[PDB]
Amino acid sequence: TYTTRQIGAKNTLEYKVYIEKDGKPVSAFHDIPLYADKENNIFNMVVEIPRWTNAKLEITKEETLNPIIQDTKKGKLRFVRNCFPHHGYIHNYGAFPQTWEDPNVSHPETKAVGDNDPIDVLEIGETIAYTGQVKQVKALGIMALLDEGETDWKVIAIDINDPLAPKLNDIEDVEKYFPGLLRATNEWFRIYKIPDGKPENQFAFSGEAKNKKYALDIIKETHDSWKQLIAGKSSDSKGIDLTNVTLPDTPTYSKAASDAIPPASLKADAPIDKSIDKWFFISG
Amino acid sequence: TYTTRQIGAKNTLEYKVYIEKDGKPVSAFHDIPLYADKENNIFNMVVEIPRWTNAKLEITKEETLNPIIQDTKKGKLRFVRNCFPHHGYIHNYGAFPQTWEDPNVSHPETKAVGDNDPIDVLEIGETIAYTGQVKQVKALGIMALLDEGETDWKVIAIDINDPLAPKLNDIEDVEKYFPGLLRATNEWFRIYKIPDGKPENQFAFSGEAKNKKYALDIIKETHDSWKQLIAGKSSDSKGIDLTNVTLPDTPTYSKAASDAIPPASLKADAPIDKSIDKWFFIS
Ligand SMILES: [Mn+2]
Ligand SMILES: [Mn+2]
Ligand SMILES: [Mn+2]
Ligand SMILES: [Mn+2]
Ligand SMILES: [Mn+2]
Ligand SMILES: [Mn+2]
Ligand SMILES: [Mn+2]
Ligand SMILES: [Mn+2]
């Protein structure tokens, strides 16, 4: 069973969420299996950001066991801004564990290096998720975002427990049951950092949402990149903390790391500056 | 000064928000002046529903001093559903006090009776408001919603404290600085109750947002309707509680009504059923 261990108050620099397996912290990057059911194409998603929120929570690469923390810019807590007509993130947003967008090779599909993280996942179901949740999802397709000039694929997925899951099998089904969502997704990822002063992003394939099989192929490639990474065989692991508690044949296996995590110290959410309310009316 | 007096927990049947003047409850419908600055047409808006929320909070006609209370449906609380691409309400939503959409006469602009309520206000500024807030706003324009067959005007306004307030002076400025907001507003009020089984709504004037001059005239008419109402001179006040604490020449003036309200009993927000998360795709 997977649960969460929260340290501190949400919306603070001290906030951390660790994932626990049967009560013991494990690495959110390395120790949660990619596959919940490999041959039925059912994946474990680690949720970072609930739909319609702003705090830019991420699995952190550089802390032991890779807890989810809030990203920062210029020493400050990062919040993604509201871009009309969207409120925060328009998906439950997270990642697949045991994957890596390899920054050390140019990816041919996109002609750009990877962004150095777990492959990203957009979960489209009705219920709002929680940070650190491990949920089981089916892949429906994938979009090739070039985010600040780096390969940053976005998998389109649904929770297998969603009432609609049985009716969603491939990417065309997304348009059928969620009409306009894929177009809004393309817009969101193009424009969301314009309020921060960044350029508009771009997609490969003129923004096409590639199908389920394409998605599976890219997921599997990023899983192979991770296999090399966790074996200690990347040419440059970028300072990622490869400590894990479930992979005893890897060089960075450590039983002790789980017990060194402090106990939960969950505090009430901290306030968020009112500026985060603002609705930006921007576009590329 | 205006403040709030909260009874109970948000998102419960017991929840009430009274508006206080100098610490004493007043009627949110009758006792807050329509104008904050009459010469400059600066209005007092009573906020009911913060942007990006679902709970259908309203000034209630049926309780003394007209506190803000959540609408109910089939013994439970009423929430407006999320309709893609929108999250709950896309405005800070409320009303102007001392106004009435008269239900006893058909309105010629829209050829329908009024919806029996204060005139409604959409406040488009950056900051999310709070329930029971009295904010001061400039009027920019107005849309003629026919809501389930009834005249249900929606004023478009901006908080005078908004950074953009100086640049927002008439309805065309809304498209200039908030492109797409008026179109989304038309869509929102057309479709928001389709998940509840209602027919789509309609607008007069093909959904045009009329300008400030036009809006001021409609607001004035609804103020005159309220002046008739509060004087006890409507042919049918529809059981509205007309009790007030600041209008001594009205038949329903009663300063003791203020002293009858219980003290604040603010509790933490209650949870909302997870079904309200759902995003409806109503194309
Ligand atoms: Mn990042
Ligand atoms: Mn990511
Ligand atoms: Mn990115
Ligand atoms: Mn990424
Ligand atoms: Mn109503
Ligand atoms: Mn109203
Ligand atoms: Mn209405
Ligand atoms: Mn109304």
Side-chain angles (χ1 to χ4, degrees), chain B residues 45 91-93 121-125 127 135 137 157-159 162:
Chain B
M45 176 190 183
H91 321 92
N92 292 315
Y93 184 86
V121 182
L122 316 181
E123 192 283 311
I124 71 177
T127 299
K135 57 171 66 215
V137 302
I158 192 154
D159 192 319
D162 192 88

Side-chain angles (χ1 to χ4, degrees), chain A residues 56 58 61 71 73 78 115 117 147 192:
Chain A
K56 208 300 182 180
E58 299 189 342
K61 296 181 287 307
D71 196 21
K73 294 284 188 189
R78 182 179 177 194
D115 75 344
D117 264 323
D147 186 8
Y192 75 116

Side-chain angles (χ1 to χ4, degrees), chain B residues 109 142 144 153 205 210-219:
Chain B
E109 303 89 352
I142 198 174
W153 296 100
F205 315 118
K210 300 292 205 183
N211 69 10
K212 176 183 184 176
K213 181 189 162 351
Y214 193 106
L216 298 180
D217 289 337
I218 301 301
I219 293 158

Side-chain angles (χ1 to χ4, degrees), chain B residues 48 56 58 93-95 115 117-118 120:
Chain B
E48 293 160 327
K56 218 300 176 182
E58 292 191 353
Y93 184 86
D115 80 335
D117 267 327
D120 299 324

Side-chain angles (χ1 to χ4, degrees), chain A residues 40-83:
Chain A
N40 284 314
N41 304 305
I42 304 177
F43 297 95
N44 289 314
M45 179 187 182
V46 173
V47 177
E48 293 161 326
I49 296 171
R51 190 174 69 246
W52 294 321
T53 71
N54 302 93
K56 208 300 182 180
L57 308 177
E58 299 189 342
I59 298 173
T60 190
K61 296 181 287 307
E62 304 87 3
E63 295 186 36
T64 309
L65 307 188
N66 313 104
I68 296 164
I69 74 174
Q70 194 158 351
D71 196 21
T72 50
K73 294 284 188 189
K74 305 180 176 334
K76 301 303 249 220
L77 292 166
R78 182 179 177 194
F79 298 87
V80 170
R81 310 304 292 275
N82 302 312
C83 300

